[PDB]
Design a protein around this nucleic acid. Sequence first.
RNA 1: ACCCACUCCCGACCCGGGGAGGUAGUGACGAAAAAUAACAAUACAGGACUCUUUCGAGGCCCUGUAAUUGGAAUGAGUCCACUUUAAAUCCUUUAACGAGGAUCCAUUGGAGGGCAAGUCUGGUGCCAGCAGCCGCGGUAAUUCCAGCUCCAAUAGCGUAUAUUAAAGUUGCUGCAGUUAAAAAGCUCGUAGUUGGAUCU
Lengths: 30, 50, 141, 180
Amino acid sequence: LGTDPYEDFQENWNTKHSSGVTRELMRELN
Amino acid sequence: GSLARAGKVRGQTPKVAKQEKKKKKTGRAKRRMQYNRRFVNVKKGPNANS
Amino acid sequence: GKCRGLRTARKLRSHRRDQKWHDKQYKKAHLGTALKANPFGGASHAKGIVLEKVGVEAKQPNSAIRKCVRVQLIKNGKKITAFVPNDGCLNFIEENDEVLVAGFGRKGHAVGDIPGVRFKVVKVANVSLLALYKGKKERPR
Amino acid sequence: PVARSWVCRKTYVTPRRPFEKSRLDQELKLIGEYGLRNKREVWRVKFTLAKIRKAARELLTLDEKDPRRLFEGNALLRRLVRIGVLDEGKMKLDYILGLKIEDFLERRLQTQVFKLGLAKSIHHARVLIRQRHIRVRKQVVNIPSFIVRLDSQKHIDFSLRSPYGGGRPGRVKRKNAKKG
RNA sequence: ACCCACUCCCGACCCGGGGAGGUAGUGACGAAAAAUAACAAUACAGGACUCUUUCGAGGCCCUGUAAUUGGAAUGAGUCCACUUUAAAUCCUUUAACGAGGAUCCAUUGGAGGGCAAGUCUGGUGCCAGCAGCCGCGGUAAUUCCAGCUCCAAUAGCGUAUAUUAAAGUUGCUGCAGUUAAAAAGCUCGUAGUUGGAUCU
Ligand SMILES: [Mg+2]
């Protein structure tokens, strides 16, 4: 029960933290 | 501009001392610790918080 | 297309010679006008004397005051502007001081917000700015 | 003018990409398995293997009965058999390209003294060798990267003048004996 | 700074001389090897692995806060002596002393992306500053100043500059010219470049 990388990326793909949310989602996927 | 605010935040920051801690291994024994930590005994990162 | 004969070496070599001068890196290196206009004269570092403390306002969208210094070079008498890198490092420099000055990372190009500045300070009065900033050495008295 | 020699080499090459995640994991596994000190000790063996593969690829482009191919192919194959990396029954120039870094890392004295039961781990072997407790054929060796020749495998023993052989006890046992 | 002991040269010369040359001093230009710990017993965060469906037994194998215990091993240093050498120094060889934990204490750069590694906590508030490039900072800053933690190389690691690769962005191999940079307004014409079958 932590944070969801999918939701994080979908909500912050165009903000300042896009480069970090992409990295976290890639870590979750692979 | 006006050269009168130089060093502002560096002089404003409160001074905090470093905590004394046990010394770090060096050389062949430091790189053994990383191997044991990452491979033999184990989607997140080494410095993940919470 | 291009000529492809067995007796074409002179044509190929002369055409390559002529067309290399349209490469701006090659022309800049091999023409000699960019070596005479370089204040350092081909050197990586140079020493100079501080004339004045200046403040250069940054280019938009940034809004700040980069703290630089005007320096006259000892070996040729030319005048340059040098950026003082870290936080509060302008407080270590005083007028009429001798400073060591280096390039600023882009081979004669400006870097970042700072407009028209190609140089940075490394040492003041034979003390590195890093040692002064980290409190390893102090200004001589 | 001096009577000096200026011939020297660099024994390693750095990787082109400094932060390749797959290569960082692969190299630390070798470091941990063979008890190496730093990444430079992997790039050295890897350089030596790279130069061996490059000579073989150059010989393999000659005629099968080229006089230089049969002279420097036999020499390279014999050299590889002598240290124990290549097999006796595989002396063909195409089996050099099947060699791996792990083959070369297994012939180190540090690995061998551990695999012969002298040391309790690969890190105990390192200190045992560096502390002058091991000899190979009556000669004391304290270089962990000493590549063991095949007909030297049987002559790795404890030093004749060490507490683990027939030597006197070290300073600590002597000092504690007089403590009472 | 020391010496003609080595390599050689010169002279009337087996004997004399040589800042040639050799030896020490300074020396992180650069290159090679290689310390900064190892082991055992304990008890767990524990982990796999065998049996008990399960509770559990684990002495089979493994990692770590171990401010938990324990003696075993060693240089680095101090320092007899020999050895080295023209005389020494250094290396090598050997008696004696020499290691438990703020020590006989590893550093240099980083933690948004390129590019490995924290939207942690405190301060500042388009200021100070960071930033090779994109960019960060306007009161909840993943980027500044610090603490903690983390990672890259390691007795080394940053910066400036020249240069090679990357650059099939100088193209012989091997690029382009309708619209992105670009075919002369058109034709003649010398040098240059290139030139159809065909002979045993
Ligand atoms: Mg990353």
